Amino acid sequence: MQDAITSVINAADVQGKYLDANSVEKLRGYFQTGELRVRAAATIAANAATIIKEAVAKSLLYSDITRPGGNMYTTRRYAACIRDLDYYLRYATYGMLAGDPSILDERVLNGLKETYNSLGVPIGATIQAIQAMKEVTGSLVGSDAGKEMGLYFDYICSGLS
Amino acid sequence: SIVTKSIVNADAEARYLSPGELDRIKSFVLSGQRRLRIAQTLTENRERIVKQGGQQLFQRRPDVVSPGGNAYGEEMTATCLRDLDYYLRLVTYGIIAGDVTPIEEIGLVGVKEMYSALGTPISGVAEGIRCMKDVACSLLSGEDAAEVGFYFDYTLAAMQ
Amino acid sequence: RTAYPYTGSGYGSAGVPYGQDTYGYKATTAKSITETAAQAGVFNTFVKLLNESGVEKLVEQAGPYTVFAPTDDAFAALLEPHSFNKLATLLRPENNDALRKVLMHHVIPGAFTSASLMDRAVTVKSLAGEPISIMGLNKLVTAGTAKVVRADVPCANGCIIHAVSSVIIPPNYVPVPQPTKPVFPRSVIAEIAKLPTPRQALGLDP
Amino acid sequence: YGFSFSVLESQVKNGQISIKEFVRSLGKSSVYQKQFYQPYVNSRVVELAFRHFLGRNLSSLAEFQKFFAILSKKGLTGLVDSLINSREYSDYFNEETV
Amino acid sequence: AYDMDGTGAGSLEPRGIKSSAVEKDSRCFKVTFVLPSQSRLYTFRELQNVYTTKMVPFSSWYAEQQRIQKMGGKILKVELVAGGQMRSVGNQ
Amino acid sequence: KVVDRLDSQPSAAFEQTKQVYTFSRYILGPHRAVVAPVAMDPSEKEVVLRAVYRQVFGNAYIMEEERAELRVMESQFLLGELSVKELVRALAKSSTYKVRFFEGAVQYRFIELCFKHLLGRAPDNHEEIAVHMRKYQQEGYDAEIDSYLDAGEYDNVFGDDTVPFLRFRGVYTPCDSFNRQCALQGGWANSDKAMGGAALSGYNGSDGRQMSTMIGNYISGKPIPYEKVAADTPLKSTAPNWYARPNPALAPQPAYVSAKEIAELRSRVSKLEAAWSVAVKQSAAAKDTVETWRAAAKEMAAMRGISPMGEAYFGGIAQKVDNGALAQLGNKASSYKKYLYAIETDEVSRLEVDLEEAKGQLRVLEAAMAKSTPMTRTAEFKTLTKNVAAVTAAEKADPLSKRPRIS
Amino acid sequence: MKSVITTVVSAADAAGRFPSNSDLESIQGNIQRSAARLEAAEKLAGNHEAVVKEAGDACFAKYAYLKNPGEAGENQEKINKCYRDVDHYMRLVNYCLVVGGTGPLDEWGIAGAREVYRTLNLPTSAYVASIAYTRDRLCVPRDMSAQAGVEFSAYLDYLINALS
Amino acid sequence: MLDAFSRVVVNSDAKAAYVGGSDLQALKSFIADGNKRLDAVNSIVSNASCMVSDAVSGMICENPGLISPGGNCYTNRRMAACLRDGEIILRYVSYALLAGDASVLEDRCLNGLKETYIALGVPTNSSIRAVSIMKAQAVAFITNTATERKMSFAAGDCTSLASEVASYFDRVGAAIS
Ligand SMILES: *[C@H](C)[C@H]1/C(=C/C2=NC(=C\c3[nH]c(C[C@H]4NC(=O)C(C=C)=C4C)c(C)c3CCC(=O)O)/C(CCC(=O)O)=C2C)NC(=O)[C@@H]1C
Ligand SMILES: *[C@H](C)[C@H]1/C(=C/C2=NC(=C\c3[nH]c(C[C@H]4NC(=O)C(C=C)=C4C)c(C)c3CCC(=O)O)/C(CCC(=O)O)=C2C)NC(=O)[C@@H]1C
Ligand SMILES: *[C@H](C)[C@H]1/C(=C/C2=NC(=C\c3[nH]c(C[C@H]4NC(=O)C(C=C)=C4C)c(C)c3CCC(=O)O)/C(CCC(=O)O)=C2C)NC(=O)[C@@H]1C
Ligand SMILES: *[C@H](C)[C@H]1/C(=C/C2=NC(=C\c3[nH]c(C[C@H]4NC(=O)C(C=C)=C4C)c(C)c3CCC(=O)O)/C(CCC(=O)O)=C2C)NC(=O)[C@@H]1C
Ligand SMILES: C=CC1=C(C)[C@@H](Cc2[nH]c(/C=C3N=C(/C=C4\NC(=O)[C@H](C)[C@H]4CC)C(C)=C\3CCC(=O)O)c(CCC(=O)O)c2C)NC1=O
Numbered sequence A: 001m002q003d004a005i006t007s008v009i010n011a012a013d014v015q016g017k018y019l020d021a022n023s024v025e026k027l028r029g030y031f032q033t034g035e036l037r038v039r040a041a042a043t044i045a046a047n048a049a050t051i052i053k054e055a056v057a058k059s060l061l062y063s064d065i066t067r068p069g070g071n072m073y074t075t076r077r078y079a080a081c082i083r084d085l086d087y088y089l090r091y092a093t094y095g096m097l098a099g100d101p102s103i104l105d106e107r108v109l110n111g112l113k114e115t116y117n118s119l120g121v122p123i124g125a126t127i128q129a130i131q132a133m134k135e136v137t138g139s140l141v142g143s144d145a146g147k148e149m150g151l152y153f154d155y156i157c158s159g160l161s
Numbered sequence B: 001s002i003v004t005k006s007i008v009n010a011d012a013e014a015r016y017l018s019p020g021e022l023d024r025i026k027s028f029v030l031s032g033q034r035r036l037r038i039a040q041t042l043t044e045n046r047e048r049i050v051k052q053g054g055q056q057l058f059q060r061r062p063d064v065v066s067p068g069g070n071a072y073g074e075e076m077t078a079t080c081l082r083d084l085d086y087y088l089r090l091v092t093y094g095i096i097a098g099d100v101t102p103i104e105e106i107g108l109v110g111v112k113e114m115y116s117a118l119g120t121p122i123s124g125v126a127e128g129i130r131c132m133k134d135v136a137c138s139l140l141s142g143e144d145a146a147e148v149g150f151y152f153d154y155t156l157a158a159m160q
Numbered sequence C: 001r002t003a004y005p006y007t008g009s010g011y012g013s014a015g016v017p018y019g020q021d022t023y024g025y026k027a028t029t030a031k032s033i034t035e036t037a038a039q040a041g042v043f044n045t046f047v048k049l050l051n052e053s054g055v056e057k058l059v060e061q062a063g064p065y066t067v068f069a070p071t072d073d074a075f076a077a078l079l080e081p082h083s084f085n086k087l088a089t090l091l092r093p094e095n096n097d098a099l100r101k102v103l104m105h106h107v108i109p110g111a112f113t114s115a116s117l118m119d120r121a122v123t124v125k126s127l128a129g130e131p132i133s134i135m136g137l138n139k140l141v142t143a144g145t146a147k148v149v150r151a152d153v154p155c156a157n158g159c160i161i162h163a164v165s166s167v168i169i170p171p172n173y174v175p176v177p178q179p180t181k182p183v184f185p186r187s188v189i190a191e192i193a194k195l196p197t198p199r200q201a202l203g204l205d206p
Numbered sequence D: 001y002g003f004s005f006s007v008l009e010s011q012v013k014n015g016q017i018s019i020k021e022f023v024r025s026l027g028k029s030s031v032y033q034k035q036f037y038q039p040y041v042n043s044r045v046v047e048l049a050f051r052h053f054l055g056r057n058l059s060s061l062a063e064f065q066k067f068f069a070i071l072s073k074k075g076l077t078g079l080v081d082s083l084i085n086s087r088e089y090s091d092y093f094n095e096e097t098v
Numbered sequence E: 001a002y003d004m005d006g007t008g009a010g011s012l013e014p015r016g017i018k019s020s021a022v023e024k025d026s027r028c029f030k031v032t033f034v035l036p037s038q039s040r041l042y043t044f045r046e047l048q049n050v051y052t053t054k055m056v057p058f059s060s061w062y063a064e065q066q067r068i069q070k071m072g073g074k075i076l077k078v079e080l081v082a083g084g085q086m087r088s089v090g091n092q
Numbered sequence F: 001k002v003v004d005r006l007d008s009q010p011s012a013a014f015e016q017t018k019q020v021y022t023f024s025r026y027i028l029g030p031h032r033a034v035v036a037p038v039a040m041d042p043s044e045k046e047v048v049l050r051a052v053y054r055q056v057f058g059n060a061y062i063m064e065e066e067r068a069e070l071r072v073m074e075s076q077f078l079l080g081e082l083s084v085k086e087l088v089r090a091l092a093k094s095s096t097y098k099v100r101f102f103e104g105a106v107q108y109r110f111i112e113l114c115f116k117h118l119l120g121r122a123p124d125n126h127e128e129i130a131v132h133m134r135k136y137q138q139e140g141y142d143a144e145i146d147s148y149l150d151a152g153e154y155d156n157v158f159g160d161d162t163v164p165f166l167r168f169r170g171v172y173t174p175c176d177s178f179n180r181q182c183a184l185q186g187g188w189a190n191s192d193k194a195m196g197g198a199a200l201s202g203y204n205g206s207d208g209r210q211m212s213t214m215i216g217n218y219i220s221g222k223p224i225p226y227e228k229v230a231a232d233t234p235l236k237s238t239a240p241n242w243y244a245r246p247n248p249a250l251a252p253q254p255a256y257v258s259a260k261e262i263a264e265l266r267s268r269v270s271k272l273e274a275a276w277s278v279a280v281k282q283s284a285a286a287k288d289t290v291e292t293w294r295a296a297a298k299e300m301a302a303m304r305g306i307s308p309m310g311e312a313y314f315g316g317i318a319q320k321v322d323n324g325a326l327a328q329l330g331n332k333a334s335s336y337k338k339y340l341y342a343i344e345t346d347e348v349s350r351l352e353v354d355l356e357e358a359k360g361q362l363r364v365l366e367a368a369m370a371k372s373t374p375m376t377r378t379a380e381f382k383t384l385t386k387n388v389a390a391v392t393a394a395e396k397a398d399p400l401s402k403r404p405r406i407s
Numbered sequence G: 001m002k003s004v005i006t007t008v009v010s011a012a013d014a015a016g017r018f019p020s021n022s023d024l025e026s027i028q029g030n031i032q033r034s035a036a037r038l039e040a041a042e043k044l045a046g047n048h049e050a051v052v053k054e055a056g057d058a059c060f061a062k063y064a065y066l067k068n069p070g071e072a073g074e075n076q077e078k079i080n081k082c083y084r085d086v087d088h089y090m091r092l093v094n095y096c097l098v099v100g101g102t103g104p105l106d107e108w109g110i111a112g113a114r115e116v117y118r119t120l121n122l123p124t125s126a127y128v129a130s131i132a133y134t135r136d137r138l139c140v141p142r143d144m145s146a147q148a149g150v151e152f153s154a155y156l157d158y159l160i161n162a163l164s
Numbered sequence H: 001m002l003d004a005f006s007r008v009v010v011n012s013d014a015k016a017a018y019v020g021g022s023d024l025q026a027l028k029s030f031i032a033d034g035n036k037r038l039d040a041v042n043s044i045v046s047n048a049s050c051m052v053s054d055a056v057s058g059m060i061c062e063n064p065g066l067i068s069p070g071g072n073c074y075t076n077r078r079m080a081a082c083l084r085d086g087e088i089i090l091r092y093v094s095y096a097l098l099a100g101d102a103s104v105l106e107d108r109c110l111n112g113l114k115e116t117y118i119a120l121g122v123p124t125n126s127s128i129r130a131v132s133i134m135k136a137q138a139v140a141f142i143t144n145t146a147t148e149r150k151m152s153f154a155a156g157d158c159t160s161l162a163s164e165v166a167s168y169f170d171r172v173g174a175a176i177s
C-alpha cells in the first residue's frame, strides 16, 4: 500500500540516500496531476451506480451469462456482480488517487483469479465488463483523466487474466 | 512427563523456564533412580497384581462375570483381565514419567466412549483398578505406596 | 540498487510484494509420495509394488519421509546373477511378507535433502527397523548401495523423493527358501541306530 | 504494560495464521486468563467472552446455558474455541478482519 | 479438559463438536479452502476474501472442517504440518 | 616476483623443496618425491622399488609371480650400480614395457605415455611431439628412450637420485598442459591399460590395441573439455578437502534432464550475471554508509588522549582505558571477525557464490543434453502454463558470413 | 625393520620436516602397549621348545602324506629341518613382539619366501596348519594375559595371511 | 634404519637367541624413560630454527673469514645454504635421538657427507665449529639450563639424554673431520 510519494520515498530510502533531483523530479510530476485526480475521483464517486449500470448493460447485460444456466442467473448471483463490479470501480479510484497500483494487487488481485476459478466465475466476461466499465469512465472524467483511471482498469484486467 | 509439560507450559507463555520449573526438572531427575525401582517392582509382579486384581473385582462385582455380565465365559474373562494388564502397564509409565500424561492420552482420553460403546460397565472397570491398587500398595513401603496408589486413584477419578 | 530485494509494503519496501507474489503462507502444489511418482512415469514398478504389498499406506502418511524410490531400470537391473538369488524368491505370490520389509527399507523418517548432505555421513534405520547409512560426499549421495540418480523431488507433506540406481536390500535380510517337500524318515530302525547310546558316549563301545 | 506476543505477531504478520487464529491464541493465552478469567466467575466469564470474541452481548437464556456448560466442562480453552469455531464468528469475521 | 469426557447423546451440555484432541494438543494442520459467505445479500456487510490458507490446530481442525462444509465451503488441501502419526505419548 | 624460478631450472642451493612445489598441489597428496637414501635397508630398497613400479607402469598389475625380466634390472639396482634414472631407463627398454605400451600403441599414444611415465608432464605443443616422432622413426625405440631421458628435462627436475612423479609444477607453459596432465594421469584408480582401452579390445585381455583419445587436441589448438579434468582426476586424489564455496567437484550426471529446467536456469544465470556487473561498480565506497563520516569522526575523537592506564576519571569514578591498537579505535572482537562472515552478509559476494553455483549446475545439466532420441523423459514439475514456443523457422541469430561463396 | 619409530621418521624424512607433535604421539603408543606385548615376548621365549614341539607334530597330524617317499617330509633329516623352520618362525614372532612392528617378519621370514617354497616344493599349507595350531592352543587367561594374547595372536595371523 | 628395539633384535639374530629376560631389562628401561625422551626431542625442535641461526651466525663472529669476499658465506646464496645445512643436520640428530640409535644418522646424512664437502669447496673445520655450537645448545635445552629460555618440565634427571645427544653430535664431527 504505497502511493506515488510512498514509492518515491521507498526507492530513495532503500538505497539510503536523500531525495535527489531525480526523486523529486517524479514527485513534482505527481503534484502537477494532483488537481486532475481529485476531480476524477470526485465525479466517479457521484456516478458510481450509474457507471456500473452502464457497463453491465453494455457488455454482459444481454448476452448468455444472464440467461438460465449461464451465470448471473440467480438474483443472488446477479447481485454479487454489481457488488463485485463496485470494488473494481472503487479500488481503481484509489489507484488513480494514490498514483500507484500497489493497492490493487495487495487488496484485489491476490487470490482473485484463483477464487473465480473456484466459484467457476468466467474470467472472460469479467474483463469485458471491466473494459466496458473503463469505457464509460473515460466518458465522465475526460480524456487524460480517463487515461489515468483507465491505466488501472487494465492493470486489474491484466492480473485477473 | 514433568519435563515435557513444564516445557510446553513455558513454551506457550513466550518465556523460558523459571527456577520453579528448573528446580523441579532438577528435582525430578535426581528422583529418577527411585522411580525405576518402584516401576521395577510392578513390572514383574503383573502376574499377581493382575490375577489378584481380578480376584477382588469378581468378588465385588459378580454381575459382570455372571451369565449376562459383559465378561462372561472363558473368552470375555480373559479380555476382562487383559484391560487390567493394560492399565497396570500405564501406571508403570506414569511412575517413570512422573505424571499421568502417559496415562492421560492412553486409556483415559475418551475412555467413556469406548466402554459405553463396548457395553462394558465403566463403573465395573473402575472397581477393577481399585482392587489392583490394594494389591500394588501392599507390595511396597509407605513412602512408595503414596505414589503407586497415587496414580491408580487418578485413573479411578477420570474413569467415572 | 541491491539485488537481493525483499517483500512487504508501505515504507521500507523494495517494490516487491510480500512473499514475492503477495502470498505470505502459500498453499502447496505438490502431490503426495505415490502419485508424485505416478506422474514421473519412471517409478512404475515402485508404485505398483507399493499398492500390491500394502506398504503404500505407510508412505501415504504425513510424517516427513525421505523415500529412495528406485526407477524401474533399477528394478530391471535386478537380473544380476548374484542379486537374483536373494530376490527372485519374492516373485512367489505367498512371499509378500519379506516384500514389505524390503520395500520398507527405502523409507527414511525425516526430510534429508541432498543439500543437507554436504560432506556428511549420517545413518538411520528405516521404517523396516534396521539401520541405513546415508552418505553424501563430493556431490554424490549414497543410501546403502543406492548411488542416487535424481537429486530430490518435493512432495506433499514436506517429504522428499530421491531416485536411486538399484534396490537396497536390508542388512540382516536372509532370502526365503524355495518351497520344498516335507520329507519324513522312511524307517525307524535307521534312527535308533543313528542315536549314540549312553554306553557309546563313555567310550564303553566303538 | 509492555506486553508482547512476538510469536503471534510473527505468525499473523506473515500470514501463517489468520486474524481469527491470532485472536483465538490470544484468548487461550495466560495474560488473558489472568486478566479476564481468574478475577471473575464462570457466569461472568461467559458474558465477558462475548464482548471480546464476538463484539456483542449474550442474546438469550439458552445461548448462556449452551456456552456456560462448555466453559463448565472445558474451561477457557474449551470456551474460546467454541466461540471462534461458531458460524456467527465466520459470518462477520473469517480469517482476516479483526 | 479434553473433549471426550463422557459427553454423548442425552447429556447435560448440548450435543456438539467432539474432537479427539489430547490435553493441550500441539498438532496443527495446514489447510486451504474457499468459503463463500452465502449471507451477504441480505446483510450487506463489507466483503472479505474467502480463499484462505492457514494453520489450524488438531484440537479444533475437526470443528473447523465440520463447519467449512456447513456453509458450502470446499476444502482444496489439508496437511498435518506439525505433529507425529500413531504417536501414543507426545502429542501434548 | 612471487615465483623466483620454475621447476625446470634446478633447485639452487638453499631449499629442500623447490619454490613452485611448496604452494602447489605437490604438498597435499601422494605425488611427491621419494628420493633414495645413500645406504639403505632392503625394506627401504623395496619402498623405492614399489614407487618405480607405480610410476613407470602407471598402476598396472605387474603380476609379481613372474617379474621375468625385472629381477635382473632389480638386482642391478639393489647392488647400487644402477641409478634410479638408470633403473627407470632400463625398465623402459624391457619387453614388459613394450608389450603393454608399444606393441599395441599408436605413436601418439606411445609418446603421450612416455611423457606421463618418464617425465611428469603432458606433451605441451605439437612440434614437441614431432621431434619424438622423427627421433623414433630414424633411430629406433632403444635409441628413442635414450634420447628421451637424457635431454635437459629429466636431469634437472628429478636428477639421477629420485623417482619420477607427477609434476604439479605451478607454472604451466601452455595452460592446457595442466589440462592434458590431469586427463592422462587419470585419478588414483585408472591405469593405462584401462585408459587406452587395451583390455576391452583384447582377446581375453591379451594382445589388444592401445588406441588413444586426445589426438584432436595435439593437432589443433583445442582445450580438453572440463569433465575429463575434474571427475576422473588426480585433483580429486590430492584434494585439499576444504570448504570450497564453489565446489570444484562435478555432480554426477542426472537421469531425466528436461529443457524446461535448463531454459529457466540459463535465464537465471543471465539474471545474476547482469546484476553482478551493476553491483560491482558501486562497491567499497557507496556501499559503506559509515565511510563518509570517517574524515570527521576521526578528528572529533582526537581529544584528551590518555598516556598511562587509568584516566578518563569522569567525575571521580574509575572508567579506565584499554590503550591497545584496536580499542583506541573503539573496535571489538566483532570487528575483525566481520570479515569471516562475509558470504551470507555481503552483497557482491552474495551474487558470485550463486553465480558459480548455478553455472556449475548449468554446465552439468546442459552437458547432460547430449542424449536425444530414445531417452525416456519425465515431468517432475507440476506441468505449469509457462512454455517457450518452437518458433525456429527463419534466421534469428545468423553469425556473420560476409564471404558466402567469395571464391 | 618396520616399526612404530621407523615408519614415523621415514615419512618425516620423506617430507623434509622435523619430528612434529604427530611423530612424538605415535611413540607414546609404543610405551602403552609394551606392558602387554613384552609379557608375551618373555612367555614365548621361556617356552619356545614345547610350543614348537606341539605345533610341529600338528603339522604332520593333518598332513600325514608328507612322510611318504618323494615328498618333503620323507625322512628324519628333513623333518628335523622342518622343526627348525617352525622354530625360526616362532623366533621371528618373539623378535617382532619386542620391536613392535612386523619388521623382523617382513625382512627375515616373509620377503622372498614365496619364491623359496615354490622352488624347493615345500607345502605352504603345511606351514599355516602349524601356525594356526598355536593360534588355537592359546588359552587367554592361562598361556599369557588377555591383552598379551591379543598381541600374540595378531602377529601369528599376520604370518598366516602373508603365507596363504 | 634401526631403532633402540631393532638394534638388540639384530644383535640377537646374529646369535639366534630369543629375546628373553636377560635382555629385556635393558629395553624396559628404555620405555621407562620414554617420557623423558619425548620431552627431549620436543625441547629441541621447539627451538630448532633459532638454534641454527645462533650457531651459523655464531660461527661467523668467531671466524670472520667466511664472509670475506670469495669466502664461503660471502654471497646471500651461500649464507642461506649454510642455514640450510645447519638445520638438515639438526633434523637428523633429532631423528637419531628420537630413535635412540644413530643408524638413521650415519647412513642417510653422514654417509657420503665428508666426500661431498670436499667436492663443494666447503671448509670442514668451520663446520666442525657450527656443529659444536649446537652441541652446547642441545645439552642446554635438554637440561633446561638455557640462559634466556626456560621450558616447562616435570623435574628430574636428563644427564643421560644430554650425553646421548652429545654422542650423536660428535658422530657428525668425526665424520666430516
Ligand atoms: C524349465 C525351463 C526347466 C524345468 C522347470 C521346472 N521347474 C519345476 C518346478 C520348480 N522350479 C522351481 C524353481 C523356481 N521356482 C521358484 O519359486 C524360484 C525362485 C525362488 C525358482 C527358480 C521350484 C522351487 C520348483 C518346485 C520344486 C518341486 O516341487 O519339485 C517343474 C515342475 C512343476 C511344473 O511344471 O509346474 C518344471 C518342469 N524343468 C525342466 O526340465 C526344464 C529344463
Ligand atoms: C587468482 C587471481 C584467482 C585464483 C587463482 C587460483 N589459481 C589456482 C591454481 C592455478 N592457477 C593457474 C593459472 C596460471 N598458472 C599457469 O601455469 C598458467 C599458464 C601456463 C596460468 C595462467 C593454474 C594452471 C593452476 C593449477 C595449478 C596448481 O594449482 O597446481 C589456485 C589454487 C587452487 C588449489 O590449490 O586447489 C587458486 C586459488 N583464485 C581466485 O579466487 C582468483 C580469482
Ligand atoms: C617342516 C614342518 C616343513 C618343511 C620344511 C623344510 N624346509 C626345508 C628347507 C628350507 N626352509 C627354509 C626357510 C627357513 N630357513 C630359514 O633360515 C628361515 C628364516 C630365516 C626360514 C623360514 C630355507 C631357507 C630352506 C633351504 C635351506 C635349509 O634347508 O634350511 C626343507 C628341505 C627341502 C629340501 O632340501 O629339498 C624341508 C623338508 N617341509 C615340510 O615338509 C614341512 C612343510
Ligand atoms: C654451512 C654451515 C656450511 C656451508 C654450506 C653450503 N652448502 C652448500 C651446498 C650443499 N650443501 C649440502 C649439505 C646438506 N644437503 C644435504 O642434502 C645434506 C644431508 C642430507 C646436507 C648436510 C649439499 C649436499 C650441497 C650441494 C647441493 C646443494 O646445492 O644444496 C653451499 C652452496 C655452495 C655454492 O653455492 O657454491 C654452501 C655455502 N658452507 C659453509 O661455508 C658452511 C661451513
Ligand atoms: C605361546 C603361547 C603359549 C601356549 C599356547 C601355551 C602352550 C601350551 N599349553 C599346552 C597345554 C595345555 N593347554 C591347556 C589349556 C586349554 N586346553 C584346552 O582345551 C582349552 C582350549 C584351554 C583351557 C583354557 C591345557 C588344559 C593343557 C594341558 C593338556 C593339553 O595339552 O591340552 C601345551 C602342550 C604341552 C604342555 O602341556 O605344556 C603347550 C605347548 N604356553 C604358551 O606359552
Ligand SMILES: C=CC1=C(C)[C@@H](Cc2[nH]c(/C=C3N=C(/C=C4\NC(=O)[C@H](C)[C@H]4CC)C(C)=C\3CCC(=O)O)c(CCC(=O)O)c2C)NC1=O
Pocket (backbone or CB within 6 Å): H047, H050, H051, H053, H054, H055, H057, H058, H060, H061, H062, H133, H136, H137, H140, H141, H145, H146, H147, H148, H149
Ligand atoms: C659473535 C657472536 C656470538 C654469538 C651470537 C654467540 C653464539 C653462541 N651461543 C652459544 C650458546 C647458546 N646459544 C643458544 C641459542 C639461542 N638461545 C636461545 O634461547 C635461542 C633459542 C637461540 C637464539 C635465537 C643457547 C640456548 C645457548 C646455551 C646457553 C643459554 O643461552 O642459556 C655458544 C656456545 C657456548 C658459549 O660460547 O657460551 C656460542 C658460540 N657467541 C658469540 O661469540
Ligand SMILES: C=CC1=C(C)[C@@H](Cc2[nH]c(/C=C3N=C(/C=C4\NC(=O)[C@H](C)[C@H]4CC)C(C)=C\3CCC(=O)O)c(CCC(=O)O)c2C)NC1=O
Pocket (backbone or CB within 6 Å): G021, G024, G025, G028, H032, H033, H035, H036, H038, H039, H040, H042, H142, H143, H144, H153, H154, H155, H156, H157, H158, H161
Ligand atoms: C607427544 C608428546 C609427548 C611429550 C613431550 C612427553 C610429555 C611428557 N614428559 C613427561 C615427563 C618427564 N619429562 C622429564 C624430562 C625433563 N624434566 C626435566 O626437569 C629435565 C629438564 C628434562 C629432561 C630431559 C622428566 C624428568 C619427567 C618425569 C619422569 C617420567 O615421567 O618418567 C611426561 C610424564 C608426566 C606427565 O604425565 O606429564 C609426559 C607425558 N610425552 C609425550 O607423549
Ligand SMILES: CCC1=C(C)/C(=C/C2=NC(=C\c3[nH]c(/C=C4\NC(=O)[C@H](C)[C@H]4CC)c(C)c3CCC(=O)O)/C(CCC(=O)O)=C2C)NC1=O
Pocket (backbone or CB within 6 Å): A065, A071, A072, A076, A077, A078, A080, A081, A082, A084, A085, A087, A107, A108, A109, A112, A115, A119, A121, A122, A123, A125, A126, A129, E036, E037, E038, E040, E047, E048, E049, E050
Ligand atoms: C476487493 C477484491 C475482491 C473481489 C473482486 C472479490 C470477489 C468475490 N466474488 C464472489 C462471487 C461472485 N462473483 C460473481 C461475478 C460475476 N458473474 C459474472 O457472470 C460476471 C463475469 C461477474 C461480474 C463481473 C458471481 C455471480 C458470484 C456468486 C457466485 C456463487 O454464488 O456461486 C465471492 C464469493 C463471496 C461473496 O460474494 O459474498 C468473492 C469473495 N472479493 C474481493 O475481496
Ligand SMILES: CCC1=C(C)/C(=C/C2=NC(=C\c3[nH]c(/C=C4\NC(=O)[C@H](C)[C@H]4CC)c(C)c3CCC(=O)O)/C(CCC(=O)O)=C2C)NC1=O
Pocket (backbone or CB within 6 Å): B064, B065, B069, B070, B071, B072, B076, B077, B079, B080, B081, B083, B084, B086, B087, B106, B107, B108, B118, B120, B121, B124, B125, B128
Ligand atoms: C490401554 C488403554 C486401553 C483399554 C482399557 C482398551 C480396552 C478394550 N477392551 C476391549 C474388550 C472387552 N473388555 C471387556 C471388559 C470387562 N468386562 C467386565 O465385566 C469388566 C467390568 C471389564 C474388565 C475389568 C470385555 C468383556 C470385552 C469384550 C467385549 C465383547 O467381546 O463384546 C476391546 C476390544 C477387543 C480388543 O481389541 O482387546 C478393547 C480395545 N484398549 C486400550 O487401548
Ligand SMILES: CCC1=C(C)/C(=C/C2=NC(=C\c3[nH]c(/C=C4\NC(=O)[C@H](C)[C@H]4CC)c(C)c3CCC(=O)O)/C(CCC(=O)O)=C2C)NC1=O
Pocket (backbone or CB within 6 Å): C006, C007, C008, D007, D009, D010, D011, D013, D014, D016
Ligand atoms: C519459532 C519458529 C519461527 C521462526 C524462526 C519465525 C520467523 C519469521 N521471521 C520473519 C521475518 C524476518 N526475519 C528476518 C531475519 C533476518 N534477516 C537477516 O538478514 C538475517 C539473516 C535474519 C536474522 C538472523 C527479517 C529482517 C524479517 C523481516 C522481513 C520483512 O519485513 O520483510 C517473519 C515475518 C513476520 C514477523 O516477523 O512478524 C516470521 C514469521 N517464525 C516462527 O514461528
Ligand SMILES: CCC1=C(C)/C(=C/C2=NC(=C\c3[nH]c(/C=C4\NC(=O)[C@H](C)[C@H]4CC)c(C)c3CCC(=O)O)/C(CCC(=O)O)=C2C)NC1=O
Pocket (backbone or CB within 6 Å): E018, E019, E020, E021, E058, E061, E062, E065, E066, E085, E086
Ligand atoms: C463428517 C465427515 C467427516 C469425517 C469422516 C471426519 C474424520 C476425522 N477423523 C479423525 C480422526 C481419527 N479417525 C480414526 C478412525 C479410525 N481408525 C481406524 O483404525 C479405523 C479404520 C477408523 C474408524 C473407522 C482415528 C483413530 C482418529 C484419531 C487419529 C489420531 O489421534 O491421530 C479426525 C481428526 C480430529 C478428531 O477426530 O477430532 C477427523 C477430522 N471429519 C469429518 O468432518
